[PDB]
């Protein structure tokens, strides 16, 4: 669900950044 | 739930023994030092030397005089580092770090002067967060401990030392990583409630 | 004395047992939730799950895991409400509320999940303030208690429970209403001093 | 090391007995009062009457009711003054002041209502700082005490009184002078480390 | 005196607002 | 060294001001 999307998005954001979901959301 | 980027990548609280001392420091710049000096208005320096504690005794006071240049904390990408600038060592307890090397998560690592240690890797945290959802709410909930790192100045604690808990060290700090905490929140708000019931009465 | 409008309509302090925990939350938006999660940078969420307390024991920790969505606090005109979003109840002690229903002002009201309760009515407060001036400085001075509201998560206290004081509950919060406190100040500064003398010595 | 001018010339912490109460007040205007009233949003008033302490007992509460207009703190050039606006006296412990008159630096001075006292002179501080470098790191380090001033409302302490320490007075405040602390920092960062070794173990 | 004016003003401001004396003063 | 300059500068700034080294540096 939305959990799988959240985890996928965090697994990607985390490879090179310390920012939260907002920073990612503005890729 | 929606999110705004934290203005501060971390926040730091200072402690003497089991007592919290001074205001929480909120870090807006990606590099900062926690030192034993006395500049009250530098966004890159958390200066412990100017914090008062009418209750402190001589062990805490002598220790404070040896913090000196203290510890430099900075992040590069999704990795957070601590560098010992002090003439005395610093001692770090980072579950994220300990899990990386297969150690107990309460393990305490010693950083001699002039050395640095990677105390957090976000990509390892994301992986652990991903696995925790399969374990239920309480498992995700405990992951806040992955986002808190504790560090003692000068004095060690744990298996190799006479002091056994961090609350026995005279001078220590507690770091919270705000970016990872927001990702944890995004997951927690989708996890439901714990299964065991609390009564209003018990 | 002159006044500037408070930027924050209320401020909230969190407690575990008799110990204050974390920084004071200052509320700038007219609606907010105090919850058990971990977003550190939302002006509408006071997130308790990210607050550390090296000293806390298991009762406080299990309770914290049951705060969940917590309590929503908002005002409409001169009225303040609390809504239980948690799966567990919350317990409120509001002198303003208790006086409205003719209860002892230390009475504790239980809010089951999904319900709300009007915990403050400013117009009733103004009337009480107006009457207090006839009673002298100390009577006006005590009215700060009308502007403070205490709330416990999950666990009740008072006559109907085994816990007898709020400091016996594992997880509670203390709300201060800043608008009414300013009106109280405008009156207090015109009330003189108390009549009974304090010596420097006693 | 580089410096930015502090936004706040001082910071003030309030205490009841040995317990810290409320948030630190940061002073941006060159004159301010610390009083016993309840305006939460005035940059020139640190209002103690609105601070809660579920733990306080009757002695602290009666005392708080007698703070009243409290103490006015302001600086003129490099000199800081305290003026007793309260109907009750205030009692000041300022090492800088005590050294000026050749008193023990722990001496406590009484300020009756309507009087003021020069509690800090920066030029005397600069001279002492200049001499301290010849005494080594620890000597410079102790000069933070020259930048902290403690004041009790209503109740005295010290030789002339039954209360012997400031932590025995019901209502007191702790002032930090940020400008002088920055000059101290500029010197400390050039003083090296103390000569006596701390072990990680002892 | 000024007490009566303060109370009258608060009794009016409080019927529909939570604001302090400044907000009222700017009616 | 730089200590002597710091002390000289503070002895001068302190005769009429409470400001830190930045305020002085901008004389």
Author numbering:
A (entry chain B), E (entry chain B), F (entry chain B): 15 to 41
B (entry chain A), C (entry chain A), D (entry chain A): 266 to 467
Paper lines:
The co-repressors SKI and SKIL play important roles in a number of different cellular processes including proliferation, differentiation, transformation, and tumor progression. They are dimeric proteins that interact with both phosphorylated SMAD2 and SMAD3 (PSMAD2 or PSMAD3) via short motifs at their N-termini, and with SMAD4 via a SAND domain (named after Sp100, AIRE-1, NucP41/75, DEAF-1) in the middle of both proteins. Upon TGF-β/Activin signaling, SKI and SKIL are rapidly degraded by the E3 ubiquitin ligase, RNF111 (formerly known as Arkadia), a process that requires SKI/SKIL binding to PSMAD2 or PSMAD3. We demonstrate that the SGS mutations in SKI abolish interaction with PSMAD2 and PSMAD3 and this results in an inability of SKI to be degraded in response to TGF-β/Activin signaling.
To discover why these eight amino acids were so crucial for R-SMAD binding, and also to understand why SKI and SKIL only recognize phosphorylated R-SMADs, we solved the crystal structure of the SKI peptide (amino acids 11–45) with a phosphorylated homotrimer of the SMAD2 MH2 domain, produced in insect cells. The structure was determined by molecular replacement and refined at 2 Å resolution and readily explained why the crucial amino acids identified in the peptide were required for SMAD2 binding. The SKI peptide binds on the outside face of the MH2 domain at the so-called three helix bundle, comprising helices 3, 4, and 5. The N-terminal helix of SKI packs against helix 3 of SMAD2, and the C-terminal portion of the SKI peptide, which contains the critical Gly34 and Pro35, forms a sharp turn that is stabilized by pi-stacking coordination between Phe24 of SKI, Trp448 of SMAD2, and Pro35 of SKI. Moreover, the NE1 of the Trp448 side chain forms a H-bond to the main chain carbonyl group of Gly33, which in turn positions Pro35 for the interaction with Trp448. Furthermore, Glu270 in SMAD2 provides a pocket, which has a negatively charged base that ties down SKI Gly34 through hydrogen-bonding to its main chain amides. Other key interactions involving amino acids identified above as crucial for binding include the main chain carbonyl of Ser31, which forms a hydrogen bond to the ND1 of Asn387 in helix 3, and the hydroxyl group of SKI Thr20, which forms a hydrogen bond with the Gln455 at the end of helix 5 of SMAD2, and is nearly completely buried in the interface. The two leucine residues (Leu21 and Leu32) that are mutated in SGS are both buried in the structure. Crucially, this conformation forces Trp448 into flattened orientation, which is incompatible with SKI binding through the pi-stacking involving SKI Phe24, SMAD2 Trp448, and SKI Pro35. As a consequence, Trp448 moves into an upright position in the trimer, allowing engagement with SKI.
